[PDB]
């Protein structure tokens, strides 16, 4: 679709950055180290794999592009050893709409590519300020993408039972449980 791959073919050192669009993707391609860093810009709010049926999930374009880029497959057919990159970086905007896209991507990773999380290949990038689609190439590289200066947060799965419940509650089709979570945890101040 619009994947800019890293030149190297050794996954142990390669990393793919998932961005929200071409606005973020453009800056990212300029600033990246094209030897070890790939960039996959999606096309915004991705499908919710908790609510959506498998027919639609497998039909989805951004889902298909991610599956192709990783080269692992989904489910039992998923293979960790066939990962094209040993760092899959979620780089969402900054804003609240980014946080949402973050939860949609982690929902997809948990449900269809759980061993990818388990192995510790899934990371969250932290942009320094508003969106990272408004950043220059040099600015974005130094702050977020430079392995010398960056701060990537490794996603870790602790309790499988508790995590199964979390996804079902937040991202599931039953509104009440999600309304309840908001009511219990929201601090308006």
């Amino acid at each position: 679709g619009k994947l800019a791959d890293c030149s190297s073919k050794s996954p142990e050192e390669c990393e793919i950055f998932l961005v929200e669009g071409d606005s973020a993707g453009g800056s990212t391609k300029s600033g990246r180290d094209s030897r070890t860093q790939a960039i996959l810009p999606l096309r915004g709010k991705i499908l919710n794999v908790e609510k959506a049926r498998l027919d639609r999930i497998l039909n989805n374009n951004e889902i298909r592009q991610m599956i192709t880029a990783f080269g692992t497959g989904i489910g039992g057919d998923f293979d960790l050893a066939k990962a094209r990159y040993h760092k899959i970086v979620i780089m969402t905007d900054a804003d609240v709409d980014g946080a949402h896209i973050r939860t949609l991507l982690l929902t997809f990773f948990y449900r269809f590519m759980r061993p990818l999380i388990e192995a510790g290949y899934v990371y969250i990038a932290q942009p320094p300020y508003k969106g990272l689609g408004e950043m220059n190439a040099d600015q974005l590289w130094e702050t977020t993408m430079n392995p010398e200066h960056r701060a990537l947060l490794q996603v870790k799965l602790e309790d499988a039972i508790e995590a199964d419940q979390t996804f079902e509650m937040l991202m599931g089709d039953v509104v009440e449980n999600r309304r309840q979570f908001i009511e219990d945890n929201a601090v308006y101040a």
Partner: peptide, 22 residues
């Protein structure tokens, strides 16, 4: 490290609250 349950709850609560109040 970053706990997946903690990230999901916080990032989703951020969006939810924002959508509701803004």
């Amino acid at each position: 490290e970053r706990n997946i349950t903690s990230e999901m709850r916080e990032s989703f609560l951020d969006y939810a609250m924002s959508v509701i109040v803004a």
